[PDB]
Design a protein around this ligand. Structure first.
Ligand SMILES: Cc1ncc(COP(=O)(O)O)c(CN)c1O
Ligand SMILES: Cc1ncc(COP(=O)(O)O)c(CN)c1O
Ligand SMILES: Nc1ccccc1C(=O)C[C@H](N)C(=O)O
Ligand SMILES: Nc1ccccc1C(=O)C[C@H](N)C(=O)O
Ligand SMILES: O=C(O)c1cc(O)c2ccccc2n1
Ligand SMILES: O=C(O)c1cc(O)c2ccccc2n1
Lengths: 404, 404
């Protein structure tokens, strides 16, 4: 810096901000010849570019001043209205909720931390959970409680046990943060009984549930789950969705659905961070949904990703040594791998990269960073030939790591 | 709320957030047939729509996957390169700076608070200053020092006095926030001597200067000022600009230019708030600049707003009673009026609205909310006939208020 010790100006929170040896390594990987399974990018082959083009023409013809002018903090009214109808009809979400549009789902998480979290408040997360929710929440200095997943999602029984111990210490949970369908990073889905069980606990222990669902329409097998938000008679769930995986990430449009008193506060919080989410992208999204394009396109997304998931699953089964394990997602973008014999996947990344493959080490997906033998693999955005090849290079990497 | 006392969940900061009685009133006024001079919107007649339409076609033809995919947190590289070349050539801003793209300049204000402000840190603002900068900064609990304006902008001599008193109390300013050209809300511009004086003080007292410049290209008379950032040999100025007034607000693209060490921290801070500013809009803004459209369009903006400023100034001169004073901006969107005889402009708004005109009371533009006889008038966004008739209704309101 040209100010020398520039840190002399930084806030306490800025002084704690660092980022991040592995994320920086993976940036560089993403630009080389290596087969990277490490990214969380949807495949641009799934962007509906013909529909987008017609919508932009329509906007410049009919909606130009609306698309181009400042919008309200709450969002573009027709998008808010069309989303609530879509969510009501498609998922059974109650029309008693209000809705705010956000600058992607990530912004919704920062706003949840601003609006709910005092330093020290306790936040429950899955172990693993979505890394950038931890990063959003960390600015507000929560304490975390981690609840492990299994193949049917959050072990809610362990949450009840941790809630009872917290009670015995005179403490309680403010927010339970869940990514219950095709989790990023785990791929697994919380079963129906556990969603209802979670809501019983939310009532009994008086907490808010944040249900963050980017991946739900990316279903390749099985039957649609019930949104936790659909089961929410008390108004304790805040539902987050986003256009990122179902339209394209580049518009940065998301939504938050929940109790009107919560929504009002969230609106006031957002107002000073950005004025409004980009209205042009909101107009695009409104046409995308209201003109029936969203519904028609989702089947093409699913058709595109399904074989990529299947390819990756098939290569894992054929190439991996005993007893590596992996999840078997019904949808979404990710497969989550556990290594045997206490291998540390973060240290093993060097070896993988030398063999031409990359993945994200799972450690940072844990609030307490205490699990070291996991990896997140992405099947949406590397060439399908390179999925088979990447999995083979990974499998050989693990073989070598396992000997002396 | 469905949760009863929903408050029980809110953070300390969220408990201290409230909607404004005046802003809510003004919203309702905008939807009515009153002549409102209270808004801060640019005129959609100045949005370059035919150019925007050509850019949108070109993006779908050649840049679709870039415009639609997630982008890096720092911003779209070509936009960042083009902006630095533009700011270098046009303003003489040094190429030793870095740049980050933001979701409007408003987001840059929130990021400045996150990155520099601990509770209690001292921020200097002009009196008046831009309301939503106070709102952004307020989440971080600064103490403010207010420095009055005159017709040549911040009275930097009063700043020196206040810096000396602070020093005598063993205290320091961390940030000086300035909107030095065609101020929102005052309309005035800091002269050249004061820009250099401010930088001498920044050096002597070791603070950072935030130079927030949405309005610079909206010049109607006079000669271009020197950017404070263009005089910045020490790397102490963070320069903010935005496409909102020179393209259209709806894309929500802004930029922050300053010392590389500062910009790296800001990038890390931003990452978890929104991932990236919407890339689609960043592609549009890149073509808008790089293809020469910004430069050709700026003269049309000026040509459009100039007569509107002039009509408002003529009407003020003809209709206003003795004792009323107003600024005489060389550019921008706003004229700032001061009432005689201790009239309270917030209590007078009631009477103004009954007479068919609205304005924003100046009180909220003061950190300490301690000046009550001021008003911000906008001339960009209602029509020229309505400016004359609005100023007349305002003048008659002031006359009535002056009795008995
Ligand atoms: C669980 C989770 N939540 C939120 C997000 C943020 O996505 P966006 O901001 O693009 O809506 C992601 C990334 N798609 C995610 O995986
Ligand atoms: C002084 C000032 N700074 C920042 C902004 C926010 O602008 P935007 O977020 O649209 O760049 C405005 C409104 N144009 C303003 O008047
Ligand atoms: N490359 C990305 C781009 C955008 C959003 C996420 C990613 C990811 O890396 C995966 C997961 N979203 C994460 O936090 O790790
Ligand atoms: N946050 C506000 C609330 C009310 C009135 C003004 C403001 C502002 O910050 C000025 C802005 N240019 C406007 O649009 O009025
Ligand atoms: O996105 C990130 O900022 C990121 C991603 C990772 O995979 C990490 C792994 C270990 C430590 C920090 C990490 N940070
Ligand atoms: O004096 C006020 O009550 C006042 C006036 C305003 O213009 C406001 C604008 C935005 C937010 C709060 C506000 N409060």
């Amino acid at each position: 810096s040209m100010l020398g010790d520039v840190e002399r100006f930084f806030s306490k929170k800025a002084l704690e901000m660092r980022a991040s040896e592995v994320r920086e390594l993976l940036k560089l990987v993403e630009t080389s010849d290596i087969i990277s399974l490490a990214g969380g990018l949807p495949n641009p082959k799934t962007f509906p570019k013909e529909i987008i083009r017609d919508i932009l023409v329509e906007i410049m013809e009919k909606y130009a001043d609306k698309a181009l002018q400042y919008g309200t903090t709450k969002g573009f009214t027709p998008l808010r209205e069309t989303l609530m109808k879509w969510l009501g009809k498609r998922y059974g979400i109650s029309q008693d909720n209000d809705i705010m549009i956000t600058s992607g789902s990530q912004q919704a998480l920062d706003l949840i931390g601003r609006v709910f979290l005092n330093p020290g408040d306790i936040v429950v997360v899955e172990a693993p959970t979505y890394l950038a929710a931890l990063q959003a929440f960390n600015f507000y200095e929560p304490q975390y409680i981690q609840i492990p997943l299994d193949d049917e999602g959050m072990k809610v029984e362990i949450l009840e046990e941790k809630l009872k111990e917290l009670k015995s210490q005179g403490k309680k949970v403010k927010v339970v943060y869940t990514v219950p369908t095709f989790q990023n990073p785990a791929g697994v889905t919380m079963n129906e009984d556990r969603r209802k069980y979670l809501l019983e606990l939310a009532s009994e222990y008086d907490f808010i549930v944040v249900e963050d669902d980017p991946y739900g329409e990316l279903r390749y097998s099985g039957n649609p789950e019930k949104k936790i938000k659909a089961l929410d008679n008390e108004g304790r769930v805040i539902y987050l969705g986003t256009f990122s995986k179902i339209l394209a990430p580049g518009f940065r449009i998301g939504w938050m659905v929940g109790d009107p008193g919560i929504i009002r506060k969230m609106e006031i919080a957002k107002q000073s961070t950005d004025l409004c989410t980009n209205v042009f992208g909101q107009v695009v999204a409104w046409r995308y949904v209201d003109g029936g394009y969203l519904e028609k396109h989702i089947p093409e997304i699913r058709k595109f990703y399904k074989p990529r998931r299947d390819a990756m699953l098939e290569a894992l089964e054929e190439f991996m040594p005993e007893g590596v394990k992996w999840t078997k997602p019904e949808g979404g973008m990710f497969i989550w791998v556990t290594l045997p014999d206490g291998i540390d996947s973060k240290k093993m990344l060097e070896r993988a990269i030398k063999k031409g493959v990359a993945y994200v080490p799972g450690e940072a997906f844990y609030a307490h960073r205490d699990v070291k033998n996991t990896m997140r693999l992405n099947f949406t955005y590397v060439d399908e030939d390179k999925i088979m090849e990447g999995i083979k290079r990974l499998a050989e990497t693990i073989k070598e790591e396992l000997k002396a």
